[PDB]
């Protein structure tokens, strides 16, 4: 049928010319049923037409098209566990979004897609319903109602075929969990494919690190209960026999470094096959080759297994590739952080030969910084150069400010409150600025701190701090006095060995003492300072200003931060008053902790702690009595009351500030006091020595699935504190508080673990060597306090 004109009925958004181009038919040509059907199908596939009808009039080919209503808005209801924005993103990725047309047939498809999304996120009973609200001018609103349901949780993890290791011991290291006690933080009990794959890899590594060279995971099964609220996981495995390592062999184009590589492949005959050691050997060879300019030093290890003797021999194939040179290192995405902040973390130099280890280390340091959510690398090639590249780092910037507020409890200090506000990347310059405060039974502290982490390009840091502190002695198990102090401090920090770190600095502090209880030690210090106060009342006051030089050295080697099983930590701190200050003295302290494992699995450990301290005055003066060293309590000698070891106060007969019978007073003049007077309340000393030996053992009764999250210890503590200036000749009737030989000893048991309230530490000890005045406190605990 020849066509002379073309007409359309229903074209609203699609252009007439666009439709004419889209339709294969054109005016002035023959048209048949096949052509009409082809045009109808093309219009249908255009995606904007709901019903298409190509009817023929007398002369004109009239087309009736019902354009699909435009989507004006998409609404969701019931997406309690799904973000609306993320759901919109998923829908628009699928294809449905605002502005486009709504197909009156793909509603079921959209609903099933959303149900599949819910199945993926975890809910297996989820339902989705779609409602359509037509609106004039060929518009429509699509609303979605979600019945999320109840998520499915893991009910059991089973391993079939393990005869040397128990299933509880094996699945103790998995990420997926099937039991979560209310008193531990072990994890959530949800199911995820990525976690399952990671767990399979963890199981394979666990067995391969023990000599089972023929270990094989036959299969895995996942089942749901008929009601779809529990998930059962089963792992069918096949552990072989333990194998020995007969020897190693290296071959390839070693590039003349065979002599240096052989030393990296030295083993003791008769060793058990291990997988982590083989990976370490490969990494060592890769670093050796990288140090000689090779960017991609490929290495592969193939084991050859002999069942007759049960021995494995490795075959290491090494290929040292070519040399690539970095032309540029580019950072993109650092809208806030300046270039140098990211650039100074690079282990690789632009304009030198390439190193993949160095690129990876730079990426790891960027991740450790904490200013970014994601970090990616892309070593691009340079057109026209066969051996040049450009390294690109792509980062997404995180938000670095924060508030924090915390509460803790303990026998040492009672209820403890902490608060603060911090900014780790001030104006993208790298400076860290914060203000913090803390409060407990016996002191209140507030500080403002500003730190530059790269005062020198090598990494030397420069920090400054302003502080205010308020301390009430009688609330801390000491003789009564009040000290309010404030000051400033500036410090440098030098890294030297990646384990060692030195620091030196200067400080100024003003101390104001009041409400001092008359006693021999305080009135011995005050006399040396030049004061002549009265010994009949505690309406006292004394102020001093001091400039001090501070120094310290830290050595950290602990393998892990939480529940370490090997290493040592040593911390030396010092202080000396520089001339021109009121107080002339020096002070030194030394902290030591050492872990020694006595097994290959690191479950039985020996811990040794020591704490030493000594201070004294220089110009005929004495160390201030508020600088003393205290011992006792859960920190130093468990089983004793805090700050109870050491010298005890000796008072003068004085009138109470406001006497009132029925109250216990320190032998006040209004109670028949006419001479010096002993006490049982500690004052401290200027020399201190404490030691502790502890044996860490597996928890006996807890289930083996999570027995590694609780630490159990048996400890023995010794300690002593003394005052080297106490002259026994004058005070003959009272004990000699300058003797270092009065050692206090206790022994007992302790438990530690992480709870929903924070860290929890409990201890029960029995002080079996103590002296008159010391107060015992067997049961001690600390809840959620880490400040």
């Amino acid at each position: 049928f020849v066509v002379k004109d073309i007409h359309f009925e229903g074209l609203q958004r699609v252009a007439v010319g666009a439709a004419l181009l889209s339709m294969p038919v054109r005016t002035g040509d023959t048209v048949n049923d096949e052509d009409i059907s082809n045009t109808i199908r093309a219009l249908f596939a255009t995606g904007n037409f709901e019903d298409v009808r190509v009817l023929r009039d007398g002369d004109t080919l009239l087309v009736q098209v019902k354009e699909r209503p435009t989507i004006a808005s998409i609404t969701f209801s019931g997406n309690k566990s799904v973000k609306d924005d993320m759901l919109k993103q998923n829908l628009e990725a699928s294809g449905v979004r605002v502005g486009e047309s709504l197909d009156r047939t793909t509603i079921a498809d959209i609903e099933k897609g959303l149900e599949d999304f819910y199945y993926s996120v975890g809910k297996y009973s989820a339902s989705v319903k779609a409602v359509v609200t037509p609106l004039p001018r060929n518009r429509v609103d699509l609303k979605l109602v979600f019945q999320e349901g109840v998520s499915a949780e893991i009910q059991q993890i089973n391993i079939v075929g393990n005869h040397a290791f128990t299933t509880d011991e094996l699945i103790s290291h998995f990420q997926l969990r099937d039991e979560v006690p209310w008193w531990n933080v072990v994890g959530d009990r949800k199911y995820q494919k990525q976690k399952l794959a990671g767990d399979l890899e963890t199981l394979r590594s666990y067995y391969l690190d023990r000599g089972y060279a023929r270990f094989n995971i036959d299969s895995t099964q996942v089942s749901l209960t008929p009601d779809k609220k529990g998930i059962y996981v089963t792992v069918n495995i096949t552990e072989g026999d333990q194998y020995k390592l007969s020897g190693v062999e290296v071959s390839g184009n070693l590039a003349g470094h065979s002599a240096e590589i052989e030393q990296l492949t030295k083993i003791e005959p008769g060793e058990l096959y291990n997988g982590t050691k083989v990976t370490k050997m490969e990494d060592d060879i890769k670093k050796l080759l990288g140090r000689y300019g090779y960017a991609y030093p490929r290495v592969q290890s193939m084991p050859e297994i002999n069942d007759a003797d049960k021995t494995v021999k490795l075959r290491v194939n090494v290929d040292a590739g070519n040399r690539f040179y970095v032309r540029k290192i580019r950072f993109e995405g650092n809208d806030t952080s300046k270039d140098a902040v990211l650039r100074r973390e690079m282990r690789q130099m632009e304009g030198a030969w390439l190193g993949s280890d160095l690129v990876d280390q730079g990426k790891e340091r960027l991740n450790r910084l904490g200013f970014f959510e994601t970090v990616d690398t892309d070593t691009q090639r340079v057109p026209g150069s066969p051996d040049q590249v450009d390294v690109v780092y792509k980062v997404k910037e995180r938000n670095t400010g924060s508030f924090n507020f915390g509460i803790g409890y303990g026998t040492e200090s009672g209820v403890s409150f902490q608060a603060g506000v911090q900014q780790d990347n001030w104006l993208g310059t790298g400076y860290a600025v914060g203000i913090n405060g803390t409060k407990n039974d016996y002191q209140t502290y507030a500080e403002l701190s500003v730190t530059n982490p790269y005062f020198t390009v090598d990494g030397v840091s420069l920090g400054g701090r302003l502080f205010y502190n308020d301390f009430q002695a009688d609330d801390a198990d000491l003789s009564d006095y009040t000290n309010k102090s404030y000051g400033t401090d500036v410090t440098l920090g030098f890294p030297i060995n990646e384990y060692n770190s030195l620091r030196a600095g200067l400080g100024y502090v003003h101390n104001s003492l009041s409400n001092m209880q008359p006693q021999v030690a305080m009135w011995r210090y005050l006399y040396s300072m030049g004061e002549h106060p009265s010994t009949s009342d505690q309406d006292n006051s004394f102020k001093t200003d001091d400039f001090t030089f501070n120094y310290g050295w830290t050595y950290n080697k602990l393998d892990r931060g939480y529940f370490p099983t090997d290493g040592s930590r040593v911390n030396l701190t010092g202080k000396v008053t520089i001339p021109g200050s009121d107080n002339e003295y020096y002070k030194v302290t030394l902290d030591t902790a050492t872990y020694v494992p006595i097994d290959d699995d690191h479950k039985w450990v020996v811990l040794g702690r020591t704490r030493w301290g000594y201070g004294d005055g220089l110009g005929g003066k004495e160390m201030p009595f508020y600088e003393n060293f205290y011992a006792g309590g859960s920190s130093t000698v468990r089983g004793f009351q805090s700050n109870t070891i050491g010298p005890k106060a000796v008072y003068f007969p004085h009138q109470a500030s406001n006497y009132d019978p029925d109250y216990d007073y320190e032998c006040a003049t209004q109670d028949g006091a006419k001479d010096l007077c002993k006490s049982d309340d500690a004052v401290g000393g200027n020399a201190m020595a404490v030691a502790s030996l502890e044996f860490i053992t597996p928890t006996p009764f807890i289930s083996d699935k999570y027995a590694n999250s609780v630490r159990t210890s048996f400890f023995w503590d010794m300690g002593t504190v003394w005052d080297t200036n106490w002259d026994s000749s004058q005070y003959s009737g009272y004990p000699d508080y300058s003797d270092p030989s009065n050692i206090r000893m206790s022994a007992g048991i302790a438990l530690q673990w992480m709870s929903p309230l924070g860290p929890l530490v409990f201890s029960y000890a029995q002080p079996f060597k103590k002296y008159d005045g010391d107060k015992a406190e067997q049961f001690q605990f600390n809840i959620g306090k880490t400040w």
């Binding site: 508030f403 507020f405 915390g406 959620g784």
Partner: peptide, 7 residues
């Protein structure tokens, strides 16, 4: 305990 919230 200790709650921490980023601003």
């Amino acid at each position: 305990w200790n709650w921490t919230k980023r601003w």
